[PDB]
Amino acid sequence: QIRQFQRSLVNQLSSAEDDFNSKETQLLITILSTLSKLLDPGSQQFLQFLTWTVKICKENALEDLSCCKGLLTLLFSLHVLYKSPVSLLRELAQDIHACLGDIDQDVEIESRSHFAIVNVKTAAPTVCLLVLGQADKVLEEVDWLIKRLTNQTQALEKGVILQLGTLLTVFHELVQTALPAGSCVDSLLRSLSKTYALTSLIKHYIQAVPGRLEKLVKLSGSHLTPQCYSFITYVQNIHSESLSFAEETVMAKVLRDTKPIPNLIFAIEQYEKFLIHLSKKSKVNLMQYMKLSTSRDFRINASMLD
Amino acid sequence: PILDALSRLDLDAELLAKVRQSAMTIVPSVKLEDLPVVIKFILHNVKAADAVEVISDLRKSLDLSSLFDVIKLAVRFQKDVSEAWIKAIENSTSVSDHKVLDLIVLLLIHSTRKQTEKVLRSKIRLGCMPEQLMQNAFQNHSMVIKDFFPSILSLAQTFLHSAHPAVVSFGSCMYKQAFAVFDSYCQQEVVCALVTHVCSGNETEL
Amino acid sequence: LVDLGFSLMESYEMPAQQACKLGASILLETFKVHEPIRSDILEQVLNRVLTKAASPVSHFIDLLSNIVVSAPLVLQNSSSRVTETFDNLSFLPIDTVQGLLRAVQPLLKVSMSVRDSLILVLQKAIFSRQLDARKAAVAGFLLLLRNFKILG
Amino acid sequence: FPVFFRVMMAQLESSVKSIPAGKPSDSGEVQLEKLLKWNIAVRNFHILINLVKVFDSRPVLSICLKYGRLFVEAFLKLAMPLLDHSFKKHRDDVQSLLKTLQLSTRQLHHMCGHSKIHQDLGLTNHVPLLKKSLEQFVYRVKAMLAFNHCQEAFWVGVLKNRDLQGEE
DNA sequence: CGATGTCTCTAGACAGCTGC
DNA sequence: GCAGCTGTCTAGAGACATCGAT
């Protein structure tokens, strides 16, 4: 049944932009997302269909927004019961960073294209909110795994460290993205506060040290915190530019675009604080990897007061 | 009979409003055997946002006078007005001095729960509800004791053991008061709860 | 088991829907195999359905239908305590009355007393000039006509 | 000293908190009356923070971290609403109060860094909340500047980490 | 406890930039 | 010659962050 629907999509998607009839595309994409639900796990047709929607994603370059959003949901509603989606999320984050600019706007990211769907336009909240939506889901179940972690214990720690290691590579390549203003920035700041709450796994292992966990903090120290603070030095100017477009009270738009920043600082230090407890107790110094905490001050420019 | 007919008849908003304000104006003026049909009508027939203060008007009407179990059944018939009653006693106790009818209807809604006990804890931390009134209530209105309803009220002491231990003493006092009236089976159930208390838990409730 | 199920329906109000499913399952199992307590189970479920309309309460009617289609004689064993339930025409008779009558259809048919009670309650309900009461009356009429079969 | 330091900070913070809360320009001649109070309050706070520099005793730092955080939070909650309306009535004196506050609270980040460097378990426990409160102050100043349409007059800049009365 | 405002957007319109 | 066509502006509707204490 899907094969005939597959034929309709491949013919319709390959058609010119003048014959896109978006209403048809949304329904046919959703019709697959509903019919693909009941495909059994123990079938090969699961795979060639799954590799087909991946290969259709690698090749096709669709500029519609709801079309991209709907199709991605299907891919993430099926690559959630077969394997670990973090491999896909990383690849999506690889493309978003390549597609958009850079957080430091000084070093040029290589113009790679893991997916052709993500263009100069689709890297907008269209995709960046879905990726962070999936990333939140992965972190949500990891909390359950961490809850379960707190002879079978060794196996649990293997996956969590491996997944979080991949998950950290996702956010590291995603926090370096030059995100536009709006809710996409706000989601990243809050989601960064979630992944750090890394704290619970550290908090559990206080009961014990393993080399794999040390490598994770080595990764976390060298991939998240120094890059994370660079984001805050950037969000301050993108909101200053966004705040000039007021009536062109404001108190709503000043205590709403900056609220995540204090919370992210607190999450970093709380994770940083529990490293102190482990470093002393576990008789191993694991802080040479990371750097000193950075804070910020101001000086009201009274010269340009009026 | 007019309100009974309008109960039988359907409802239209414009007339319902004026007739219902007229009813509220004429609830307390009649003998205690006559207004219960009016209260039952406004309970199971009328439901609106203004009920949150109409029930306060009813509380003021019934404040003085406080066998007459028809009001309880009328409140049983509907539950949304009971939630409105909880909302009203959230602020009625904030101004009025916890009349006996307030605690009676609070027991009734707690019987028919989570919001009631949240309100109870809040006013435990707020004003501790001088319990002489409820002592008089258990002295005169013991016909609705039925320990299953005040059992949760007593076991709320366990949640009230984190702080404010005086309210635990007040709960002990009111279980002492409720024991010495009637209901020998309820008395033995109370003794069973007390031996449960001396068995499980720390030495405080012991 | 029966206390656990009673408080399961109490604590319901998706994990809550799964809790409803588990409670219905355990209640049906303990009703099907336990003889002297099935009357107690029927009394508990009859006392639990009343004064419950804000939360989705379709579970009560559906498990009642299942347990009466598995064992219809329990109500007569309970001396037909469903007569008091006829007052539900004022709480929420949008779908609960229809499902309840659907469930109790065979026991209304076999038992003449409950049929007489139903016809009299609906006869006094129909001429009540309330929209809700008339809706309940017509809903009951929709079922009572097909309750009795003579076509063949 | 540490007993004196504890009681002095506690009393100063309590007196600062006891000041009446925010008001939407309800009364004239009060928006300047209730600014000299906070001027002398921040003067006292700066004096105490300077007195920290001579006595680096661990209980002294433990007191200072917590009570500086509490005083900063109280300032943000109470004085700043007054500042929103009083900025138009009075311009330089409120600015001077802000300069004094930045002069004082800038040392608290140095104390947090020093606590983190020495891995003091019993002293680093207060770092995160204080750092969050300092960031909250940094951005609430932006909010106050927005209350009077002064948005190009703000510049949040990186703070160079320093040792207690030292460097780095 | 959670009603509410804020925001990505998809289209339509009549109105500015094509034209005429 | 003022007849044609070409697009940001505005209202629809739906999802989210904090909205503001119960």
- DSSP-assigned letters across all residues of chain C: -HHHHHHHHHHH--HHHHHHHHHHHHHHHHHHH-STTHHHHHHHHHHHHTT--SS--HHHHHHHHHHHHH-TTHHHHTT-TTGGGGGGGTT-TTTHHHHHHHHHHHHHHH-HHHHHHHHHHHHHHHTS--HHHHHHHHHHHHHHHHHS----
Tell me which residue has tokens 């980490």: D161
D157 forms beta bridges with A297
What tokens were used for B146? 């039925």
Question: CB of A82 within 8 A of CB of A41?
Answer: yes
Of C51, C54, C130, the CB nearest to B10: C130
Tokens describing residue A48: 């060639």
B79 and chain C in contact, CB less than 8 A:
yes
Look up residue D158 and give its DSSP letter: E
- d(Cα C136, Cα A279) in Å, to the nearest integer? 71
Q: Dihedral (C-alpha) B16, B18, B22, B27: value to the nearest 10 degrees?
A: 40
Choose among D64, D82, D83: nearest CA to D12: D64
Please state, in angstroms and rounded to a whole number, the distance separating the CA atoms of residues C95 and C88: 11
Strand E atom within 7 Å of A21 CB: no
Residues of chain A immediately before an interruption (C to N > 2.5 Å): 150, 197, 208, 248
Matching residue, tokens 């009299």: C120
Asked whether residue A182, judged by its CB, lies under 7 Å from any atom of the DNA or RNA strand E, the reply is yes
First to last CA, chain A: 70
Q: Which residues contact A111 (CB under 8 A, 6 or more apart)?
A: A98
Q: In D, which residues are within 8 Å of A233 by CB distance?
A: 158
Query: Are the CB atoms for A176 and A168 separated by under 8 Å?
Result: no
CA distances to B127, C69, D130 from C5, rounded to whole Å, are 38, 20, 50
DSSP 8-class letter at A205: G
Helix (H, G, I), strand (E, B) or coil at D159: strand
**Shortest CA distance to B79 belongs to which of C121, C92, C128?**
C92
Subunits with 3+ Cβ pairs within 8 Å of D are: A
**In terms of C-beta density within 10 A (0-12 exposed, 13-18 middle, 19 or more buried), how is residue C14 classed?**
exposed
Structure tokens at B53: 């203060």
B112 touches chain C (CB under 8 A): yes
Nearest CA in chain B to C127: B8
Q: What angle do CA D123, D128, D129 make, to 5 degrees?
A: 100
> What's the first-to-final CA gap in chain C, in angstroms?
45
Tokens of D24: 């939407």
The amino acid present at D82, given as its one-letter code, is L
Mutation site, C11, C13, C47, C51, interface B, largest B CB count within 10 A: C51
End-to-end CA distance of chain D: 27
A30 C-beta neighbours (distance < 10 Å), count = 14
**Is B41:B6 a contact under the CB 8 Å cutoff?**
yes
Return the structure tokens found at A253: 């738009």
Whether A80 CB is under 7 Å from strand E: no
Contact A273 D127 (CB under 8 A): yes
> Cα A198 vs. chain centroid, distance in angstroms?
16
Contact B8 C51 (CB under 8 A): no
d(CA A136, CA A130): 10
Contact D86, D35 (CB under 8 A): yes
Other beta carbons within 10 angstroms of residue A141's beta carbon come to: 10
Tell me the C-alpha distance between A10 and A6, whole Å.
6
Q: Cα–Cα distance between A226 and A292 in angstroms, integer?
A: 9
Q: How far apart are CA B171 and CA B156, in angstroms?
A: 9
> Nearest 5°: CA angle at A279, between A266 and A283?
170
CA A160 – CA D71 distance, rounded (Å): 42
Residue with tokens 């002491």: B157
**Residue D72, token pair as written in the block:** 């900063």
Encode B102-135: b = buried (16+ Cβ within 10 Å), e = exposed. Answer: bbbbbbbbbbeeeebbebbeebbeeeebebebbb
| Mutation to test the A interface, candidates D72, D127, D130, most A Cβ within 10 Å | D127
Q: Which residues, at least 6 apart from A163, have a Cβ–Cβ distance to it below 8 Å?
A: A84, A86, A138, A142
Backbone φ, ψ for residue A148 (5° rounding):
-65, -35
**DSSP 3-state of D55:** coil
- Residue A279's SS3 state is helix
Half-sphere exposure of A10 (CA within 13 A, CB side): 12
Rounded-to-integer distance, Cα A175 and Cα A227, Å: 7
Dihedral class, residue D149 (left if φ above 0, else alpha if ψ from -120 to 50, else beta): left
Tokens of D42: 């921040």
Q: Which residue of B has its CA nearest to C126?
A: B8
First to last CA, chain B: 57
Report the C-alpha gap between A130 and A115 in whole angstroms. 15
Q: What is the residue type of A246?
A: A
Please state how this structure was obtained.
cryo-EM
Q: How far apart are CA C12 and CA C20, in angstroms?
A: 7
Q: Could you give the CA distance from residue B27 to residue B41 in angstroms, rounded to a whole number?
A: 11
From C71, C104, C69, select the one nearest C88 (Cα to Cα).
C104
Q: Which of B107, B99, B116, B39 is nearest to B64 (CA)?
A: B99
- Composition of chain B by helix, strand, coil, percent to 5: 70, 0, 30
SS3 of chain D: helix, strand, coil, percent, to 5: 70, 0, 25
Q: What is the 3-state secondary structure (H, E, C) of C97-136?
A: HHHHHHHHHHHHHHCHHHHHHHHHHHHHHHCCCCHHHHHH
Q: Is B69 exposed, middle or buried (0-12, 13-18, 19+ CB in 10 A)?
A: exposed
Tokens of B105: 């209807």
Resolution in A: 3.6
The CA distance from A163 to A139, in Å, is: 10
How far is A292 from A269, CA to CA, in rounded Å? 11
d(CA B120, CA B150): 13
A147: left (phi over 0), alpha (psi -120 to 50) or beta: alpha
Which tokens hold the place of B185? 């089976």
Q: What are phi and psi of A102, to 5 degrees?
A: -125, 155
CA atoms C21, C22, C25, C31: torsion sign: negative
Q: What angle do CA D110, D115, D118 make, to 5 degrees?
A: 125
All residues at 6 or more sequence positions from A145 whose CB lies less than 8 Å from its CB, including other chains: A156, A159, A160
Q: Name D156's bridge partners.
A: A298
- Residue A296: strand pairing partners: D158
d(CA C108, CA A108): 81
- C-alpha separations of A172 from A168, A228, A231, D20 in Å: 6, 8, 11, 46
**Alpha-helix runs per DSSP H in A123-250:** 125-149, 153-175, 183-196, 199-204, 211-223, 225-243
- Beta carbons within 8 Å of B22's beta carbon, 6+ residues apart: none
Q: Which two tokens stand for residue D96?
A: 């001077």
Nucleotides of F under 7 A from a protein CB: 16-19, 22
Q: Is D157 helix (H, G, I), strand (E, B) or coil?
A: strand
Nearest Cα to Cα of residue A258 among D144, C28, B50, D37: D144
On whether any CB of chain D is under 8 Å from the CB of A15, the answer is: no
The CB density around residue A287, as the number of other CB atoms within 10 Å, is: 18
Whole-angstrom Cα distance, residue D146 to residue D140? Answer: 9
List beta partners, residue D159: A295
Beta bridge partners of A295: D159
Which pair of structure tokens corresponds to residue C28? 């049906």
Distance CA A234, CA B117 (A): 49
Please report which helix (H) or strand (E) contains residue D31, including its range. none
The distance of A253 to chain D (nearest Cα, Å) reads: 9
Structure tokens at A168: 């950290």
Any bridge partners for residue D158, and if so which?
A296
List of long-range contacts for D7-15, beta carbons under 8 Å, 24+ apart:
D8/D48, D9/D48, D9/D63, D9/D64, D9/D67, D9/D68, D9/D71, D10/D67, D12/D41, D12/D44, D12/D45, D12/D48, D12/D71, D13/D67, D13/D70, D13/D71, D13/D74, D15/D41
Query: Nearest Cα to A187, choosing from A139, A252, A155?
Result: A139
